[PDB]
Protein backbone atom coordinates (compact mmCIF):
# COMPACT_ATOMS: atom_id res chain seq x y z
CA UNK A 1 0.00 0.00 0.00
CA UNK A 2 1.04 3.63 -0.41
CA UNK A 3 3.41 5.53 1.86
CA UNK A 4 3.20 9.19 2.78
CA UNK A 5 5.43 11.20 5.09
CA UNK A 6 4.20 14.68 6.05
CA UNK A 7 6.85 16.81 7.76
CA UNK A 8 5.69 19.67 9.99
CA UNK A 9 9.11 20.34 11.60
CA UNK A 10 11.40 22.92 10.03
CA UNK A 11 14.88 21.76 9.15
CA UNK A 12 16.20 23.88 12.06
CA UNK A 13 13.46 23.01 14.59
CA UNK A 14 15.52 20.52 16.58
CA UNK A 15 18.53 22.80 16.85
CA UNK A 16 16.51 25.81 18.01
CA UNK A 17 14.64 23.62 20.50
CA UNK A 18 17.97 22.42 21.90
CA UNK A 19 19.31 25.98 22.14
CA UNK A 20 16.38 27.16 24.20
CA UNK A 21 16.12 24.04 26.40
CA UNK A 22 19.81 24.32 27.31
CA UNK A 23 19.77 28.10 27.71
CA UNK A 24 16.83 27.85 30.13
CA UNK A 25 17.66 24.61 31.93
CA UNK A 26 21.24 25.50 32.87
CA UNK A 27 19.96 28.66 34.62
CA UNK A 28 17.37 26.93 36.82
CA UNK A 29 17.93 25.93 40.44
CA UNK A 30 18.55 23.12 40.39
CA UNK A 31 19.72 22.90 36.79
CA UNK A 32 17.67 20.58 34.61
CA UNK A 33 17.50 19.33 31.02
CA UNK A 34 14.60 17.67 29.17
CA UNK A 35 15.26 13.98 28.44
CA UNK A 36 14.38 14.28 24.71
CA UNK A 37 18.01 15.11 23.98
CA UNK A 38 19.34 11.69 25.05
CA UNK A 39 18.28 10.21 21.72
CA UNK A 40 20.89 11.07 19.11
CA UNK A 41 22.36 8.13 17.19
CA UNK A 42 24.68 7.12 20.06
CA UNK A 43 21.96 7.58 22.68
CA UNK A 44 19.43 5.52 20.71
CA UNK A 45 21.80 2.56 20.44
CA UNK A 46 22.49 2.90 24.17
CA UNK A 47 18.74 2.90 24.86
CA UNK A 48 18.38 -0.24 22.73
CA UNK A 49 21.03 -1.87 24.92
CA UNK A 50 19.16 -0.78 28.05
CA UNK A 51 15.97 -2.52 26.89
CA UNK A 52 17.86 -5.85 26.98
CA UNK A 53 19.34 -5.44 30.47
CA UNK A 54 17.95 -7.82 33.10
CA UNK A 55 17.64 -4.89 35.51
CA UNK A 56 15.43 -2.88 33.10
CA UNK A 57 12.19 -4.88 33.48
CA UNK A 58 9.75 -2.40 31.75
CA UNK A 59 10.47 -3.48 28.18
CA UNK A 60 9.91 -7.20 28.76
CA UNK A 61 7.05 -6.62 31.22
CA UNK A 62 5.09 -4.59 28.68
CA UNK A 63 5.95 -7.08 25.90
CA UNK A 64 4.60 -9.94 28.05
CA UNK A 65 1.29 -8.07 28.48
CA UNK A 66 1.13 -7.27 24.76
CA UNK A 67 1.80 -10.86 23.69
CA UNK A 68 -1.08 -12.01 25.89
CA UNK A 69 -3.53 -9.12 25.31
CA UNK A 70 -3.00 -7.66 21.78
CA UNK A 71 -5.81 -9.84 20.38
CA UNK A 72 -8.17 -8.51 23.06
CA UNK A 73 -6.99 -4.96 22.36
CA UNK A 74 -7.83 -5.43 18.67
CA UNK A 75 -11.30 -6.85 19.34
CA UNK A 76 -12.18 -4.33 22.08
CA UNK A 77 -11.16 -1.23 20.06
CA UNK A 78 -12.21 -2.57 16.61
CA UNK A 79 -9.71 -0.11 15.11
CA UNK A 80 -8.83 0.01 11.44
CA UNK A 81 -6.04 2.53 12.02
CA UNK A 82 -3.08 2.27 14.39
CA UNK A 83 -1.62 5.65 15.44
CA UNK A 84 1.74 5.20 17.17
CA UNK A 85 3.08 8.07 19.26
CA UNK A 86 6.59 6.82 18.57
CA UNK A 87 8.85 5.74 15.74
CA UNK A 88 7.26 2.40 14.75
CA UNK A 89 10.51 0.47 15.06
CA UNK A 90 9.70 -2.01 17.85
CA UNK A 91 8.45 -5.57 17.96
CA UNK A 92 5.50 -4.19 19.94
CA UNK A 93 4.44 -2.18 16.89
CA UNK A 94 4.24 -5.43 14.91
CA UNK A 95 2.34 -7.20 17.73
CA UNK A 96 -0.40 -4.57 17.45
CA UNK A 97 -0.39 -4.43 13.64
CA UNK A 98 -0.53 -8.24 13.55
CA UNK A 99 -3.53 -8.24 15.90
CA UNK A 100 -5.47 -5.78 13.73
CA UNK A 101 -4.48 -7.67 10.56
CA UNK A 102 -5.63 -10.96 12.07
CA UNK A 103 -9.14 -9.46 12.51
CA UNK A 104 -9.01 -8.26 8.91
CA UNK A 105 -9.40 -4.63 9.97
CA UNK A 106 -5.89 -3.17 9.46
CA UNK A 107 -6.21 -0.36 6.89
CA UNK A 108 -3.78 2.35 7.99
CA UNK A 109 -0.65 2.87 10.12
CA UNK A 110 0.24 6.39 11.36
CA UNK A 111 3.64 6.63 13.09
CA UNK A 112 4.03 10.06 14.71
CA UNK A 113 7.48 11.27 15.85
CA UNK A 114 10.08 14.01 15.54
CA UNK A 115 12.69 12.33 13.28
CA UNK A 116 11.61 12.22 9.65
CA UNK A 117 14.49 9.91 8.73
CA UNK A 118 13.46 7.27 11.26
CA UNK A 119 9.83 7.66 10.17
CA UNK A 120 10.83 7.17 6.54
CA UNK A 121 12.66 3.92 7.30
CA UNK A 122 9.72 2.64 9.33
CA UNK A 123 7.24 3.44 6.56
CA UNK A 124 9.34 1.55 4.00
CA UNK A 125 9.69 -1.44 6.34
CA UNK A 126 5.97 -1.58 7.17
CA UNK A 127 5.09 -1.19 3.49
CA UNK A 128 7.21 -4.27 2.78
CA UNK A 129 5.80 -6.30 5.69
CA UNK A 130 2.08 -5.42 5.43
CA UNK A 131 0.42 -5.38 2.03
CA UNK A 132 -2.82 -3.48 1.70
CA UNK A 133 -1.88 -1.07 4.52
CA UNK A 134 -1.50 2.65 3.89
CA UNK A 135 1.27 4.25 5.97
CA UNK A 136 0.85 7.96 6.77
CA UNK A 137 3.90 8.97 8.80
CA UNK A 138 3.66 12.35 10.53
CA UNK A 139 6.78 14.25 11.61
CA UNK A 140 5.59 16.61 14.35
CA UNK A 141 5.61 17.26 18.08
CA UNK A 142 2.98 16.86 20.83
CA UNK A 143 2.82 20.61 21.45
CA UNK A 144 1.77 21.65 17.97
CA UNK A 145 0.86 18.82 15.65
CA UNK A 146 -1.54 16.26 17.13
CA UNK A 147 -4.20 17.82 14.87
CA UNK A 148 -2.03 16.78 11.89
CA UNK A 149 -2.73 13.08 12.55
CA UNK A 150 -5.02 11.88 9.70
CA UNK A 151 -8.74 11.69 10.54
CA UNK A 152 -11.34 9.14 9.56
CA UNK A 153 -11.88 5.50 10.39
CA UNK A 154 -11.59 4.12 13.90
CA UNK A 155 -8.22 4.97 15.43
CA UNK A 156 -6.25 3.20 18.16
CA UNK A 157 -3.67 5.64 19.52
CA UNK A 158 -0.69 3.97 21.21
CA UNK A 159 1.83 5.50 23.66
CA UNK A 160 3.86 2.66 25.20
CA UNK A 161 6.94 2.17 27.37
CA UNK A 162 5.83 4.52 30.18
CA UNK A 163 7.18 7.44 28.12
CA UNK A 164 4.24 9.36 29.58
CA UNK A 165 6.10 9.17 32.92
CA UNK A 166 8.62 11.69 31.48
CA UNK A 167 5.89 14.34 32.01
CA UNK A 168 5.31 15.66 35.51
CA UNK A 169 1.63 15.85 36.56
CA UNK A 170 0.95 19.34 35.15
CA UNK A 171 2.32 18.79 31.64
CA UNK A 172 1.01 15.19 31.70
CA UNK A 173 -2.58 16.36 32.22
CA UNK A 174 -2.11 19.00 29.51
CA UNK A 175 -0.86 16.35 27.10
CA UNK A 176 -3.69 13.90 27.81
CA UNK A 177 -6.20 16.73 27.42
CA UNK A 178 -4.68 17.70 24.06
CA UNK A 179 -4.62 14.07 22.87
CA UNK A 180 -8.23 13.41 23.88
CA UNK A 181 -9.18 16.62 22.06
CA UNK A 182 -8.05 15.19 18.71
CA UNK A 183 -9.67 11.82 19.37
CA UNK A 184 -13.13 11.06 17.95
CA UNK A 185 -15.87 9.13 19.77
CA UNK A 186 -15.03 5.46 19.30
CA UNK A 187 -11.30 6.12 19.13
CA UNK A 188 -9.10 4.41 21.72
CA UNK A 189 -5.82 5.01 23.54
CA UNK A 190 -3.50 2.21 24.71
CA UNK A 191 -1.22 3.65 27.42
CA UNK A 192 1.75 1.96 29.10
CA UNK A 193 2.60 3.01 32.65
CA UNK A 194 5.32 1.62 34.90
CA UNK A 195 4.02 0.92 38.40
CA UNK A 196 5.17 1.89 41.88
CA UNK A 197 7.13 -1.00 43.37
CA UNK A 198 10.11 -1.72 45.62
CA UNK A 199 12.41 1.31 45.60
CA UNK A 200 15.59 -0.75 45.24
CA UNK A 201 14.26 -2.53 42.14
CA UNK A 202 13.35 0.86 40.69
CA UNK A 203 16.79 2.39 41.32
CA UNK A 204 18.52 -0.71 39.98
CA UNK A 205 16.49 -0.45 36.73
CA UNK A 206 18.03 3.02 36.24
CA UNK A 207 21.62 2.16 37.25
CA UNK A 208 22.64 -1.18 35.80
CA UNK A 209 26.01 -2.39 37.15
CA UNK A 210 27.79 -2.30 33.75
CA UNK A 211 27.04 1.42 33.45
CA UNK A 212 24.97 1.39 30.25
CA UNK A 213 22.40 3.75 31.74
CA UNK A 214 25.22 5.83 33.19
CA UNK A 215 26.68 6.16 29.70
CA UNK A 216 23.23 7.03 28.32
CA UNK A 217 22.77 9.80 30.88
CA UNK A 218 26.24 11.31 30.44
CA UNK A 219 25.74 11.27 26.67
CA UNK A 220 23.43 14.29 26.92
CA UNK A 221 26.58 16.26 27.81
CA UNK A 222 28.28 14.96 24.66
CA UNK A 223 25.29 16.08 22.59
CA UNK A 224 25.42 19.56 24.11
CA UNK A 225 29.22 19.76 23.67
CA UNK A 226 28.97 18.75 20.00
CA UNK A 227 25.84 20.65 19.00
CA UNK A 228 26.23 23.89 21.01
CA UNK A 229 30.05 24.08 21.23
CA UNK A 230 30.10 23.40 24.97
CA UNK A 231 33.05 22.21 27.10
CA UNK A 232 31.49 19.88 29.67
CA UNK A 233 34.13 17.59 31.16
CA UNK A 234 31.89 14.58 30.50
CA UNK A 235 33.93 12.25 32.74
CA UNK A 236 33.72 14.63 35.70
CA UNK A 237 29.94 14.07 35.89
CA UNK A 238 28.64 11.03 37.76
CA UNK A 239 25.39 9.23 36.97
CA UNK A 240 23.01 9.20 39.95
CA UNK A 241 19.62 7.48 39.93
CA UNK A 242 17.32 8.54 42.79
CA UNK A 243 13.93 7.32 43.98
CA UNK A 244 11.81 10.34 44.96
CA UNK A 245 9.48 8.79 47.54
CA UNK A 246 7.28 11.88 47.89
CA UNK A 247 6.42 12.28 44.19
CA UNK A 248 6.81 8.52 43.43
CA UNK A 249 9.18 9.11 40.53
CA UNK A 250 12.63 7.93 39.50
CA UNK A 251 15.02 10.81 38.80
CA UNK A 252 18.24 10.67 36.81
CA UNK A 253 20.84 13.25 37.83
CA UNK A 254 24.36 14.14 36.74
CA UNK A 255 26.63 15.03 39.67
CA UNK A 256 29.65 17.30 39.35
CA UNK A 257 32.88 15.79 40.71
CA UNK A 258 34.46 18.97 41.98
CA UNK A 259 33.58 22.49 40.93
CA UNK A 260 32.97 22.96 37.19
CA UNK A 261 32.74 25.98 34.90
CA UNK A 262 31.14 25.27 31.54
CA UNK A 263 30.92 27.65 28.60
CA UNK A 264 28.25 26.94 25.99
CA UNK A 265 29.65 28.83 23.02
CA UNK A 266 26.65 28.75 20.71
CA UNK A 267 24.65 30.42 23.50
CA UNK A 268 27.34 32.81 24.80
CA UNK A 269 26.63 31.38 28.25
CA UNK A 270 28.81 30.40 31.21
CA UNK A 271 27.43 28.36 34.11
CA UNK A 272 29.02 27.15 37.34
CA UNK A 273 28.59 23.80 39.11
CA UNK A 274 29.45 23.54 42.79
CA UNK A 275 31.33 20.40 43.78
CA UNK A 276 28.69 17.72 44.21
CA UNK A 277 26.00 19.83 42.53
CA UNK A 278 23.48 17.64 40.72
CA UNK A 279 21.66 18.46 37.48
CA UNK A 280 18.34 16.77 36.72
CA UNK A 281 18.26 15.08 33.30
CA UNK A 282 15.12 12.91 33.47
CA UNK A 283 12.10 12.18 35.63
CA UNK A 284 10.38 8.81 35.24
CA UNK A 285 7.10 9.00 37.14
CA UNK A 286 5.75 5.73 38.48
CA UNK A 287 2.04 5.06 38.72
CA UNK A 288 -0.67 3.42 40.78
CA UNK A 289 -3.43 1.57 38.86
CA UNK A 290 -6.40 3.57 40.18
CA UNK A 291 -4.61 6.87 39.61
CA UNK A 292 -4.05 6.14 35.90
CA UNK A 293 -7.78 5.58 35.46
CA UNK A 294 -8.44 8.89 37.21
CA UNK A 295 -5.98 10.83 35.01
CA UNK A 296 -7.56 9.35 31.88
CA UNK A 297 -11.04 10.31 33.10
CA UNK A 298 -9.84 13.83 33.90
CA UNK A 299 -8.73 14.16 30.26
CA UNK A 300 -12.13 13.08 28.92
CA UNK A 301 -11.26 9.42 28.30
CA UNK A 302 -12.81 6.34 29.88
CA UNK A 303 -10.66 3.34 30.76
CA UNK A 304 -12.28 0.09 29.69
CA UNK A 305 -9.35 -2.31 30.26
CA UNK A 306 -6.43 -2.46 32.66
CA UNK A 307 -3.77 -5.19 32.49
CA UNK A 308 -0.58 -5.96 34.38
CA UNK A 309 2.14 -8.51 33.79
CA UNK A 310 2.28 -11.58 36.04
CA UNK A 311 4.45 -9.75 38.59
CA UNK A 312 2.39 -6.55 38.73
CA UNK A 313 5.46 -4.62 37.56
CA UNK A 314 3.87 -2.73 34.65
CA UNK A 315 0.40 -1.71 33.51
CA UNK A 316 -1.40 -1.15 30.21
CA UNK A 317 -4.64 0.84 29.96
CA UNK A 318 -7.10 0.79 27.06
CA UNK A 319 -9.31 3.90 27.17
CA UNK A 320 -12.08 5.09 24.88
CA UNK A 321 -13.16 8.54 23.77
O1 LIG B 1 11.74 5.88 26.82
C1 LIG B 1 11.14 6.63 27.57
N1 LIG B 1 11.20 6.44 28.94
C2 LIG B 1 12.05 5.34 29.60
C3 LIG B 1 13.58 5.77 29.55
C4 LIG B 1 14.65 4.96 30.28
C5 LIG B 1 14.89 3.58 30.31
N2 LIG B 1 15.99 3.34 31.14
C6 LIG B 1 16.41 4.58 31.59
N3 LIG B 1 15.63 5.56 31.09
C7 LIG B 1 11.64 5.00 31.17
O2 LIG B 1 11.26 5.95 31.83
O3 LIG B 1 11.76 3.84 31.51
C8 LIG B 1 10.27 7.80 26.70
C9 LIG B 1 10.54 9.26 26.77
C10 LIG B 1 11.04 9.67 25.59
C11 LIG B 1 11.13 8.81 24.64
C12 LIG B 1 10.46 7.60 25.22
Numbering used by the authors: 1 to 321
Copy text verbatim from the article accompanying this structure deposition.
EgtD, an S-adenosylmethionine-dependent methyltransferase (AdoMet), catalyzes the trimethylation of L-Histidine to initiate EGT biosynthesis and this reaction has been shown to be essential for EGT production in mycobacteria and for long-term infection of murine macrophages by M. tb. Synthesis of EGT by Mycobacterium tuberculosis (M. tb) is critical for maintaining bioenergetic homeostasis and protecting the bacterium from alkylating agents, oxidative stress, and anti-tubercular drugs. In this work, library screening and structure-guided strategies identified multiple classes of M. tb EgtD inhibitors that bind in various regions of the enzyme active site.
The only difference observed is a rotamer change in the side chain of Glu282 resulting in slight reorientation of the carboxylate moiety. However, the presence of a hydrogen atom on the α-amino moiety of HD6 now affords a bidentate interaction between Asn166 and HD6, which is more similar to the interaction between EgtD and the L-Histidine substrate. First, HD2, HD3, and HD6 most closely resemble a Histidine amino acid as they all possess α-amino and α-carboxyl moieties, but the α-amino group is elaborated with a variety of chemical linkages. The reason for the 1.5–2.5-fold decrease in the HD6 inhibitory activity versus HD2 and HD3 is less clear but is likely derived from steric hindrance between the cyclopentene and the narrow constriction separating the Histidine and AdoMet binding sites.
